[PDB]
Symmetry: D2
């Protein structure tokens, strides 16, 4: 099984598997059951922005989501990710739909990792090309004619389809920590557009870090966000 | 009086003004009396590296100092710096000597600030030019013929002089936070060479953030590190 | 008199002082009389993007302007800028109106300089704050309530006023070259909105590099773009 | 056959296949026979630094090599690399030895590509880990216990072996240009240590850009630098 650290943008409350009452942002450490959540006041139909950051000295993984001119929602969790992830990881974005749906559109994605022992990896996408060679697209993930990364199935009219899962992994493995490292840090930004007809959009988007060979776990559909094989 | 947030590399223990027993790294918030310290196992005569970071979401100011192949020393302090500093600051490095001395040599200095509401300021020096126009040199601060930033007086033979104070401020004011900011962050690295004849080198080096018009406070000598007018 | 290297976005053709027949982008080296121009097919009312780059090895200063989904316009000029500018410069944006006008709105501005002998300065603005401490605003330059940098006078209704001049200089001087430098390079991006009622918008926008103490030359109005005291 | 754009650091003059009389830096466009060369005054046993840059507006690929406090050697070649390379490439470093040898030690390697239509890829290595997951090591390429990238075979005593070829490719494919691109640019730095017993060190090091599936061509040994299958 994969090792997952994720920041989830969870549009759909699954209280029966640990979710709070409402859409929330969450820090997921090896379980869909968030270690820390904050209430996410969704603005379906508007472009959202997520900023994620961590450094191995502060050991605080923090995420903030906002829309233009809105209140931001922040969530934090003290965690030494060295105890969780392998030295070499891949970073990615995942999304699902289930019984309920939403577009899981990524409009931009950037990521900077740094490893002082100064090693560094930065990538940033504003356009996604029709054939992203530097992306590993998994499942229903695809780039559309607007150069948007669509993590989950969307029809031609642009209606999201349910029971879809998809992710994009940056092609290059990231060295997020190392024995002699004095400090490893990473930051990530993605902007997203969740549109839905359902009065309860589902299921969400995550930025995630995993073992380099990470694949979509069987049964990771819907509330599991394409990240976990079960709700444990 | 100036508003100071600093990370101090305090070679000299002044227990009578709050210092612990030993050389320490410290997070200073508006007082030379550190909110958080860690024991700093000095390696006088060796090049040291300090990494400082903070973002307004995690609200954890963290610093780590190390020498090649040594144990690092980290120190952290949870603090919303918005409650401390004005929106616009200058960043700088300060050093002092007093009764006891040490060279306060800066070999490199870099700083990245970011302000999402994405505004950004990055500077990095590996060489310091004989006339640093982008630096505001205060007190005894000067760049030498090796292109090294010497914060405190050093003779021609290169012996440090006591009772010296000096700082370098990056010329451009940094906008470290702002009303609409969703997340402001900064990182700073400097490398330093502290050499001393004294069996107790003094007094230390800091990276600091202050009101843009920050100047060396009268009586900020020695244990006060060129940052504070008193030990309160 | 100031030393000017500029890339001009010249909305208004002044053939009587060297301009070609039409709006053009130009590389200006110590004269409003461009060393190289390209025809600039203006799209008044649309957001434009200028990319400027140079490195001291290739010695090719190049600029490209485009609007979304349009043909770009590029202009180049082989020049060792070491022979032109002093070691320490300030970078800025200038605009003018004269008999004819246009808004000279800067929506973003970034600049990266690098100096290997690796010294570096990066700044990028997407918002401009009401009081830009890191900007030196000259003349009619001001930031508006949209966080836009307006180089020239615009009324409350947002109509541009004629006979206006204004510039913004990044506060920190840039070390663009140095005796021991192996390679100095800089890149600059700004995005701009030129709106005009006049069927001939005037007078233009430039990104420019100048002696650090650069000020708006008397008589630099209109076709002189706030950069030169005469048309020589 | 692969499509190669390379900057060669050619320690060994092979005049019978187009080389000038002496060690040279060269811009190679789809042939080991450089389009442009400059005399490279080698400093075997000293750490060298190569800076490579290009942008699609200036269309000038330029490289400079230097050692601390030495005269630099620059070479340029006007070329639209869009006419040469496919949209998606991999960047790498190659080295060979043949009858004569040298260590082909890479101490650092960084690369920034940018694609405005702002997409971007930056990586920088100062240490190379024992298992570089983000590097595709080809042939004799390996990282040693000093965290140095050794492109060609070096014995335990650290003596280079002849008839060796090796390269490291950054794992992630780079999108170096694209139909809608307004400007694509890349910069690359690597530092290298060439040590040799031979009074004629061979054969050299290159930074290269190639089709993503680039492999070491059969017969690319020695003077062909692991880049070309023949000397045509
Ligand atoms: O898209 C939202 C959800 O729909 C599915 O579960 C449902 C949530 N509301 C329901 C009501 C009835 C039935 Br049957 C089901 Cl499966 C569900 C599942 O796919 C969930 O994993 C998912 O989170
Ligand atoms: O350089 C170290 C220190 O020397 C001075 O205080 C002294 C520390 N040891 C002493 C012993 C005697 C006397 Br008098 C003095 Cl001032 C000191 C002062 O300058 C201090 O601020 C400083 O920290
Ligand atoms: O804004 C465009 C121009 O207007 C002025 O010159 C005029 C261009 N068309 C004209 C026609 C008549 C007279 Br009088 C004048 Cl000054 C001009 C001047 O301010 C110029 O510098 C400028 O380029
Ligand atoms: O390392 C340097 C060179 O050695 C080989 O060619 C030789 C250059 N000097 C020679 C002298 C005699 C013979 Br046989 C050979 Cl193959 C060579 C070949 O491996 C070349 O490709 C290479 O550039
Ligand atoms: Ca859920
Ligand atoms: Ca002290
Ligand atoms: Ca004109
Ligand atoms: Ca050769
Ligand atoms: Cl339901
Ligand atoms: Cl004492
Ligand atoms: Cl007229
Ligand atoms: Cl021979
Ligand atoms: Mn959840
Ligand atoms: Mn102290
Ligand atoms: Mn003109
Ligand atoms: Mn050659």
């Amino acid at each position: 099984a994969d090792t997952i650290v994720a920041v989830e943008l969870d549009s759909y409350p699954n209280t029966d598997i640990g979710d709070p009452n409402y859409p929330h942002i969450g820090i997921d450490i090896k379980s869909i059951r968030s270690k820390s959540t904050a209430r996410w006041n969704m603005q379906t139909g508007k472009v959202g922005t997520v900023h994620i950051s961590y450094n191995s000295v502060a050991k605080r993984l923090s995420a903030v989501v906002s829309y233009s001119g809105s209140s931001s929602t922040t969530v934090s969790y003290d965690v030494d990710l060295n105890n969780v992830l392998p030295e070499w990881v891949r970073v990615g974005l995942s999304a699902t739909t289930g019984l309920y749906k939403e577009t899981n559109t990524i409009l931009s994605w950037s990521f900077t990792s740094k490893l002082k022992t100064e090693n560094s990896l930065h990538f940033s996408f504003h356009k996604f090309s029709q054939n992203p060679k530097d992306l590993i697209l998994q499942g229903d993930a695809f780039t559309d004619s607007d150069g948007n990364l669509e993590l989950t199935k969307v029809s031609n009219s642009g209606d999201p389809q349910g029971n879809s899962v998809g992710r994009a992994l940056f092609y290059a493995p990231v060295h997020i920590w190392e024995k002699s490292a004095v400090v490893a840090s990473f930051d990530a930004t993605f902007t997203f557009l969740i549109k839905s007809p359902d009065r309860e959009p589902a299921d969400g988007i995550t930025f995630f870090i995993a073992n380099t060979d990470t694949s979509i776990p069987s049964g990771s559909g819907g509330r599991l966000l394409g990240l976990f094989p079960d709700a444990n």
